[PDB]
Homo-oligomer: A and B are copies of this chain.
């Protein structure tokens, strides 16, 4: 089993959270245009996921911690149900993050 299907160093960062309900670690994150806060990636756009949640959230925190770089194992991330496969594969394209098979 794995999480970091890569050698390129994984770094973390903090940011204002806009998540209200409980969300588990390893959930892709995106920015909420209206508020500028981080929330779960909705899977609507490739390149929109700008981070991966490090630790799980209750849904009441004002801040959160996420991975801003690194190569992750696709199978370890909590993807939104029914997400488009192409947008999934290119979810982090543009950031320092990326993902692939374990193997």
Interface residues of A (CB under 8 A from B): 6, 8-9, 11, 13-16, 18, 31, 33, 35-38, 45-47, 50-51, 63, 68-69, 71, 84-87, 89-90, 93-96, 98, 100
Partner of A14 from B16, B18, B100 at Cβ < 8 Å: B100
Bound Cα distance A90, B62 (Å): 12
Q: For the complex formed by this chain, how many copies does it contain in all?
A: 3
| Cross-chain contact B71 with A31 (CB below 8 angstroms) | no
**Residue of B at shortest CB range from A62?**
B86
Q: How many Å lie between the Cα of A94 and that of B15 in the bound state? A: 11
User: Given A36-B90, A38-B93, A90-B37, are A31 and B47 also a contact pair (CB < 8 Å)?
Assistant: yes
| Residues on the B chain within 8 Å of A84, using CB | 36
Other than the given A35-B86, A69-B96, 13 more pairs (CB < 8 A) read A8-B11, A8-B69, A13-B71, A13-B93, A13-B98, A16-B89, A18-B86, A36-B46, A36-B84, A38-B90, A50-B94, A63-B89, A95-B96
